[PDB]
Amino acid sequence: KSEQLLRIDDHDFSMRPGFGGPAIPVGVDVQVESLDSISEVDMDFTMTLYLRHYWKDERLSFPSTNNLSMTFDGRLVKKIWVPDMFFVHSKRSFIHDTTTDNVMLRVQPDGKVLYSLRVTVTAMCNMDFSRFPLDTQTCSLEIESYAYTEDDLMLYWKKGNDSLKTDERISLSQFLIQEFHTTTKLAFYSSTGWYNRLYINFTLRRHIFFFLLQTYFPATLMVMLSWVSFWIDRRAVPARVPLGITTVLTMSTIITGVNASMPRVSYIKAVDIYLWVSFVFVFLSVLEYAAVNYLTTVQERKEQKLRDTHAIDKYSRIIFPAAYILFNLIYWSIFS
Amino acid sequence: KSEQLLRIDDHDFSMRPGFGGPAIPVGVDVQVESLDSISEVDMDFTMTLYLRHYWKDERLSFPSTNNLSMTFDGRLVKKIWVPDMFFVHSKRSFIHDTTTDNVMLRVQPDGKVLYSLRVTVTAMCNMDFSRFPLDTQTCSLEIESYAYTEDDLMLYWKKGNDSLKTDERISLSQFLIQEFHTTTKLAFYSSTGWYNRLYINFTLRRHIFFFLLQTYFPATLMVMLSWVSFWIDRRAVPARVPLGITTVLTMSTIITGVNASMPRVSYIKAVDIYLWVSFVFVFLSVLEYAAVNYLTTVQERKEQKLRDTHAIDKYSRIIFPAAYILFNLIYWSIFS
Amino acid sequence: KSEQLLRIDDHDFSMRPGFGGPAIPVGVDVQVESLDSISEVDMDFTMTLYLRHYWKDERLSFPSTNNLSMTFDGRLVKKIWVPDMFFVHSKRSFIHDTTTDNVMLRVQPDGKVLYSLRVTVTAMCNMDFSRFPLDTQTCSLEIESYAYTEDDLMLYWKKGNDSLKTDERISLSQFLIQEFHTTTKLAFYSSTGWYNRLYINFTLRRHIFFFLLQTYFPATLMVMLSWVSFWIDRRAVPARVPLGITTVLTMSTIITGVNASMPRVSYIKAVDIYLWVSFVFVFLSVLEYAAVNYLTTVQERKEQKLRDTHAIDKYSRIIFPAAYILFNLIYWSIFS
Amino acid sequence: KSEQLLRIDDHDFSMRPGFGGPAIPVGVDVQVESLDSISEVDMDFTMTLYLRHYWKDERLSFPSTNNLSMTFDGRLVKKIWVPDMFFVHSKRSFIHDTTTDNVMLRVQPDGKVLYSLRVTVTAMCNMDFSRFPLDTQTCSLEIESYAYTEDDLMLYWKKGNDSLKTDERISLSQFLIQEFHTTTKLAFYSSTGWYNRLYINFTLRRHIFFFLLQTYFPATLMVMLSWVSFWIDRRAVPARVPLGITTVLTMSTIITGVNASMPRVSYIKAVDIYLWVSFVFVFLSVLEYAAVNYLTTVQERKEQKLRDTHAIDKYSRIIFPAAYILFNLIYWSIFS
Amino acid sequence: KSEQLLRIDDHDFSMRPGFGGPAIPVGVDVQVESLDSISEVDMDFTMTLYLRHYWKDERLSFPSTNNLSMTFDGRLVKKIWVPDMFFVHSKRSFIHDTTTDNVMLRVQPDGKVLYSLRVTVTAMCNMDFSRFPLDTQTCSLEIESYAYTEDDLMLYWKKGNDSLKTDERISLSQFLIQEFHTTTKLAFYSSTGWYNRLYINFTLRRHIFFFLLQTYFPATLMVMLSWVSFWIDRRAVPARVPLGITTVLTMSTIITGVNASMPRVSYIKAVDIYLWVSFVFVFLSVLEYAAVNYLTTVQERKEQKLRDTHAIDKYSRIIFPAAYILFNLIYWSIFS
Ligand SMILES: CC(=O)[C@H]1CC[C@H]2[C@@H]3CC[C@@H]4C[C@H](O)CC[C@]4(C)[C@H]3CC[C@]12C
Ligand SMILES: CC(=O)[C@H]1CC[C@H]2[C@@H]3CC[C@@H]4C[C@H](O)CC[C@]4(C)[C@H]3CC[C@]12C
Ligand SMILES: CC(=O)[C@H]1CC[C@H]2[C@@H]3CC[C@@H]4C[C@H](O)CC[C@]4(C)[C@H]3CC[C@]12C
C-alpha cells in the first residue's frame, strides 16, 4: 500500500509544519485559462484558472532506492495538511468534478509537495460609466489565507512576475483585454491581525468607432438636415412646418432607440448630453421660423391696413453652424 | 493529537453550556463585505458578510505552559456545541467552500471560543413605488436563534453600535446607500415563547436629475411646442392640422418609450399622471383649432349667403400657459 | 448522554407507532412567512412557510424528576420515526441549511413530540386570462402523506381554521392577496387506496385603474380625435387625408406598444377586441371621406361638362358617436 | 427488526434474480402529473410523472401467519437489487426529496415487489416552424434500461395501452395537448447489443384565430387602404404623395412590431412571405402614381409649348384587387 | 459475493497497471447524442455524449468455467483504478444520476475492462462576427488526461476515424451542422511535461436567404423609392419635401428595428456599412432638391427684379443609380 510508506497514523496532521517555530513559506503559481462572462449591471466577472501550491513537509518523507515521485488524487487531501486559500471579494465559486475531482498531489522523496486544482471563481468589480463610451475600467483578483496570519504562514509569488501565464486566445465579446501584472500588499484585520494578499490586475477597453457610428453620426446628420429650412422661401408654410415637426419626431425616435440599446445604468452620461443638446438645437430651429412667420403676417396686415429674405434667416444661417461647431469643440476638448 | 487535549469523549456536547442554570450569553459581530444585487420586481436584495460569535465554555479548557491558542477548521464543529443562528425572512443562502469550508474556530486556554464563517444571504424587502422616482426605501436584515428561547440563550451585540463595519467601496449601480445602524427587539412565538432578534438597517435613494432629464424635459418641450399653432394664421389649415397630429404622435411615442424603460410595476405613479396631463393638454390644443376653423367657415358661408385674429386664439394664448403653470405648481407642491 | 435516556437500540423505529392497531393521528400547523414570486407564463408560484407536526409515541418516554423537556436537532431524525409528508403538484422544493439544518425536535416526558422545519416550495396553478385585465384567479397548496393510507395514518388540522397564520406584511408587486382559508378532502389512488389531503386557499386580484389609464384612455382619445375631420371643409384634401393616415399610424403604434408590454399569452383577450374595434372605426373614418371626395369630383365634372356641407358628413357626425356609445354599452354590459 | 425477516446478509444482491437463466420480466406503469414548461428556442419540454416497477424476487420471501405486506422507504434500496431505468435523450432530471426521498417499496409475502418514485425530467424535441403559425408538432418520451440487454432484462408495458394515465387538468399556456398513446420498439447498440425501449407520444397545436387577428388582419387592411389613392383627383399631389409614404411607414412599423413578438427562429416562414408581398404591393401603389404625375406634367408642357381620369388609374382600379385576390387564393391553397 | 472473485484486498489500486514499466494504452470511443444550446454573446456551446474507455488489467482476472462476463455499477469505481479523463477549456459539466448514476463497468475473464458513462459538458468557442451574416465558425471539443503524462498513460482513438458516431437527428435552431472529424495533437506543460490530447471538430453555417430578405430588401426598396422625387415637378414643394423627410424617418426606423433584433456584439459589421451607405444616399437625395429649390427661387427673383426640367434633376437621374450599382458591385465583390 502506497499510503503505508508515509507514516500517516504516526503524525498529527491538524497542525501546520514547523509548529511553534518560524512561519512556513508557501509559493503560488497561477495560469489563467479563459474569461467566461462579464456583467455590467451587477459589476462582476467570471474567470477559470489553475491554482498551484509549493511547500515542504518533512513528515511526508519516505525512503526510496531511486528519485521517482508518487502521485495521489484528491482522496489523500483529507488525511494531510493543505493550505486553506480562498478568494477575497468573491460571490460564488466551485471546483470541477468531471469525471472526477480535478485535484492532484505529487510528493517528492525529501518531502516537497505540489498541490494543483482547477477552479472557477466570480469576483466583484466596481465600475464607473461617467465617461461612457470612452471609459476605462480596471479589475483585480485577490488571494489570501483564511485562518493563518503572517506569523504562521508566509505567502508569496514563487517566481515574481513570471508566475502568471495567460492563454493566447483569451478574449471578450465587447471588451479589449491588456496589461496583465501582479502585485502584493499586506492587509490588517482587527479581529486576528495581519495577512498577506496577492493581486492579479488587468484593464478593459471598448470599441470607439462602433459607438461613434451608431450614435454620433445620426444625431449630427439630423442637426445638419434641420438647417435646410433656412434656405427655403418663407412663403411656403406647409413645407416649412412639417419638415421641422418631422425632424423633431425623427430625433425623438432616434434618442429612444439609442437609449433602448444601452445597459441600464441610471445616471447621466456624456452621450445623453450630446443628444439633448442636439434636441434643443432642433427645437430652436422651429421657434425661429415660427417668429419669422408671425412677423411677416404682422407686417403684411399693417401694410394692408395702411392703404426678399428676412434678416432672421440671414443671421441664423451663420449663427447656428458656428454655435454647433463651438459646442463640439468644447465637448471634444473636455472629454478628449 | 490536538483533539485529545480537549476531553471530547468525556462530555455530552448535545446540551448547551450551563444546562439547568442561567442563560449563556452570546456576542455577535458583523462585517459587511459587499452588496451583490437588488431586484425591484421580486423585492429582495443580496448581501455577503462575515459572521462572528463569542461565548465561553469551561468544558473546552486545556492545560498549557503558555498563553498560546489552538486553531481548528470546520471539521471540529460536528464534535462540539455551536449556536444555531439563522436569518429571518430569507429566501436562499449558502456558505462558501472554496477551496475549503470558510469556517474557523479558535479556543483559548480558559475556554473562550471564537467562531467565524463567511455567508451570502438573500432577504426580502417590501417596497412602495407610489412616489417614484422620488421614493425612499428602507431595508433590514434580521438574525435570530432558531431553537433556543431567551431563557436558555441570550443574544446581544458585543460592542453596541461599534459591532457593525462596512467596506469603504460598497456601492450599487442605480441606488445610493447611507445610514447604517443596528437595533434590537424581542419577538414572541405562540408555539415556543420569546426570542431575541437583531437588526441591520440602511436606506436607499435614487438619482433625481437623470430621471428628470430623461422624462420631464421632453414632455414639457412638447407641450410648449404644441402652443406654436396659436401664432400661425388661421387660413393655413394644411399647416395647422398636420402640426397638431404629428405632435400627438410624438407625444404618444415618447410616452410609450418612457413606459418601456421602467420596471414592470402595475400601479399608478406620479410620472404617469404628469404624462397623461400633458397628453390631455395636447389633445385640447387640437380641439381648439378645430372649432376655430368650423366657426370661420360658418361665418364666411353666412356672409356669402347674405350678398384679423380670432378671439379664441387671443384668449388661448394666455389661458394655456397659466393653466399649465398652475398645474405644475400644484404638482410640485404635493410631491415636493 | 441524552440519547441513552431514550432506548433507541431497544426498539425498531422502522415501523409506525401502534403498528397492527388503529391509525395514529397526526396534527399539522402551518405559518406562512412570505410569497416570493409568481410566474404567469409558466403558471406557478413560490411560498416559504413553517411546517409543524404533532403526535405521541410511548417508546420515547423517559423518566424525569421534573417536567422539563429535551430539545434535539435534525441529527436525531434519522434514528426515530417521523411522518413522510410531501407537497402535491409541486415542481421544486428544498430545506434551508444555514447555518445548519432548520430542523427542531422536542420530546415531552410522556412521549409527546413536536417536529418543526422551514421549507420553500413551488407549486403549479392553472390560470385563465380570458377576462384580462378583469380576471380573478384562485390558487391552492396541498399536503398529503406519501406512503401511508388513512388506515395507518390519520391527518387533520390540529385547531381547525385556527391552524393557519399569515404574516402581516405579505404582499405581491402586481397582485392583491385576500381570503385565506383551509379545507380538507379525501383522495383515491387505484394503486394503494385512499389518502387524506389538506388545502390552503387564497385569491388574487389586479389593479383595474392602472390598466384602464394605460390602455383604454389612449384608444378612446384617438377614436374621438378621428372624428375631427367631419367638421373640416371638404375642399381641403391635403388637410383631410394626412390627418386620417397619421391617425391610423398612431393607432397602429399604440396597439403595438400595448401588445409589447403584456404577458405572452397566445389567445384572444377583451382588450384586443376593444383595440381592433377602434382600429376598424378609424379605417371607416377614412373610407367615408374617400367616397365623399370621389362624389364631389364626379358632380363637379358633370356640371362642367353640362355647360354647403355634404349629406354624408351630416349623417356621419351623428352616426359614428352613437354607434361607438352603443358598442361601449354592450361591451361593458358583457364584461361588467 | 423488520430487515432481519429478509435474509439480507445471506444473499448476493449485486446480481439480477434468476442469474444464468431466462431473462426476468419487468412491468412499468406511468402516471403523468403535469407539464411544466416548453422552450421553442432550445426545443425541449419538462414533465413531472410517477414511475412504477413490478417484478418478482424469491430471495425476498419471508414467512407470515397472514397476508399483510411490509412497506419500506428509500433507505432499503441500497441493500437490494433494483432496475436501473433511465430516460433517453434527456437533458436534466432529479428526484424530489421534500420532506424526504419520494421512494416507496412494498414487498409481498411470496416475493412480489412494488417500486415507485416521483421524478421530473427534461427531454429534447426537434421542431419545424416552416408552416408557422399553422404547424403541428409531435413529441416523445423514452424509457430504456442502461446496462441490461434483452437477454437479461425484459421490459414491457404491464397493461398495454391502459398503463398510461394523465391528469384531468393538464394544460399549456400557448399549446393544445391531445392524443396520448404508447408504443414499443427495439434499439441496437454496436457496443453491447439490443435493448427494449418504450415511448409516450402526444401532439401539440396552436390557436389559429389569435395569430390571424394579430397579423393577417392589419396587413390586409393596410393593403386595402393603399388603394384609396386611385379614387382621388390626380391634381392633388400634396394629398396623393403623403398618403402613400405614410402607408409605407405604417406597413414598415407593423412588420417590425410583428417580428418583435415572434420567437427568434432564423429561417423563412409563410407569414413573412405574406407581409413582404403586401409591402411590394404598397410600393407599386406609389410607383404607379409617380409615373401618372410624370406623364401628366409632360403632356401639359407639350400642350403649352404647342401654343377626366387617366387610363392608368382606370386599369389599376381593376388590376390591383384581382391580383391580390389571386395571390390570396394561391397562398391559402398551398398552406391550407 | 461477486466482489470476492476479484482479489480487491490483495492489491494496491492507487497505482496504475504496469507501474515502473511501459505506459498503459487506453482507447476512447465517443458517441454524440445531441446539441443542447449555443450562446453567441458568451461564446460557448453545450453537448451531451457517451464516453467509453478500453484498457486491460491483469489484477482483475478471475477464474471461470465459461466465457461469461460480470457487470458492475458505479459503486465499484471507488475500489479500482480508472483513468482520470477531463475536458479542456470547459466551463461546467455534470454526470446524470437519474434514477441512479449512469456508470457501467464490464470485466472480462482475462482482465479486459469496459468503462462507460453519460456526461453533459459546456465548452468555450471563440467566434468572429466580422463577416456577419456571411460568417463561418469552427468549434472543437478536447479530451486530455489530468495527472498522467505520455510516459505513464498513452491515449489514442481506438478505431481511428470510426470511433466517432453522431445521432441522425442532431440539429440546431439557427445553425447548420456539418463536417464531423477527429484529430490528435501533443500538448506541453512546463510544470509536468507532455500530454496527449484529442479533438472533435465541426462547422456551423447560417441561413443566408432569411437575413437577405429581412435586411437587404427593405433598404434597397427604400433607396429606390427615394429616387421618385427626381420625376416630380419642381414647383410642388409641399409634395417634394415631406416625401424626403418621411423617407428619412422610415429609413431610421428600419435601421433601428434591424439593430434591435441582432445579437449584442459591439463592433462594426458589413450589414451596418450597407445600411449607413443607404442612409447617406437618402440624405443626399434631399440636399439635391434643397439646392434646386434655392436656385430656382434666386433665378425667379432676379428675373422679376430685371423687369422645363432643371439640369440638376436630369443629371441626378443618371448619376444616382449608377453610383448605387457601382457600390453594390464593389460590396458584393469584397464580401462575396
Ligand atoms: C411674438 C412672436 O414672434 C411669437 C411667435 C411664436 C411665439 C411663441 C410660440 C410658443 C409659445 C406660445 C405661448 O402661448 C407663449 C410663449 C411662446 C414661447 C411664444 C412666444 C411668442 C412667439 C415667439
Ligand atoms: C361646433 C364646433 O366648433 C365643432 C368643431 C370640432 C367639433 C368636435 C370634433 C370632435 C367630435 C366629433 C363628434 O362627431 C362630435 C363631438 C366632437 C367633440 C365635436 C364637437 C363640435 C366641435 C367642437
Ligand atoms: C365609388 C366610391 O365612392 C369610391 C371612393 C373610394 C372607393 C374605395 C377605395 C378603396 C378600394 C379600392 C379598390 O380599387 C376598390 C374597392 C374600394 C373599397 C373602393 C370602392 C369604391 C369607393 C368607395
Ligand SMILES: CC(=O)[C@H]1CC[C@H]2[C@@H]3CC[C@@H]4C[C@H](O)CC[C@]4(C)[C@H]3CC[C@]12C
Ligand atoms: C418614365 C416614368 O414614368 C417615370 C416616373 C417615375 C420613374 C421611376 C422612379 C423611380 C426610379 C428612379 C430612377 O432614377 C430611375 C428608375 C425609376 C424606377 C424610375 C423609372 C421611370 C419612371 C417610372
Ligand SMILES: CC(=O)[C@H]1CC[C@H]2[C@@H]3CC[C@@H]4C[C@H](O)CC[C@]4(C)[C@H]3CC[C@]12C
Ligand atoms: C447654396 C445652396 O444651394 C444651399 C441650398 C441648401 C443649402 C445647405 C442646407 C444645409 C446646410 C445649412 C447651413 O446653414 C449651411 C450649410 C448647408 C449644408 C447649406 C449649404 C448651402 C445650400 C446647399
Ligand SMILES: CCCCCCCCCCCC
Ligand atoms: C443657438 C441659438 C441661435 C439663435 C440665433 C438667433 C438669430 C437672430 C437674428 C436676429 C437679427 C435681427
Ligand SMILES: CCCCCCCCCCCC
Ligand atoms: C386648459 C383648457 C384651456 C381652454 C381655453 C379656452 C379659451 C376659450 C376662449 C373663448 C373666448 C370667447
Ligand SMILES: CCCCCCCCCCCC
Ligand atoms: C359605424 C359605421 C358608420 C357608417 C355611417 C355611414 C353614414 C352614411 C350617410 C349617407 C346619407 C345619404
Ligand SMILES: CCCCCCCCCCCC
Ligand atoms: C400587381 C401589379 C399591378 C400593375 C398594374 C399596372 C396597370 C397599367 C395600366 C396601363 C394602361 C395603359
Ligand SMILES: CCCCCCCCCCCC
Ligand atoms: C452619389 C452622389 C451623386 C451626386 C449627383 C450630383 C449631380 C449634379 C449635376 C450638376 C449638373 C450641372
Ligand SMILES: CCCCCCCC
Ligand atoms: C466612422 C463614423 C464616424 C462618425 C463621426 C461623428 C463625429 C461627430
Ligand SMILES: CCCCCCCC
Ligand atoms: C470638430 C471636432 C474637433 C475635435 C477637437 C479635439 C481636440 C483634442
Ligand SMILES: CCCCCCCC
Ligand atoms: C437637468 C434637466 C432638468 C429638467 C427640468 C424639468 C422640469 C419640469
Ligand SMILES: CCCCCCCC
Ligand atoms: C414651476 C415649478 C415650481 C416649483 C415649486 C416647488 C415648491 C416646493
Ligand SMILES: CCCCCCCC
Ligand atoms: C359608457 C359606459 C357605460 C357603462 C355601463 C356599465 C353597466 C354595468
Ligand SMILES: CCCCCCCC
Ligand atoms: C378573427 C380575425 C379574422 C381575420 C381574417 C384575415 C384573413 C386574411
Ligand SMILES: CCCCCCCC
Ligand atoms: C380568399 C380566401 C380563399 C381561401 C380558399 C381556401 C381553399 C382551401
Ligand SMILES: CCCCCCCC
Ligand atoms: C429573397 C430576398 C432577396 C433580397 C435581395 C437583396 C439584394 C440587395
Ligand SMILES: CCCCCCCC
Ligand atoms: C448587383 C449585384 C452584383 C453581384 C456580383 C457578385 C460577384 C461575385
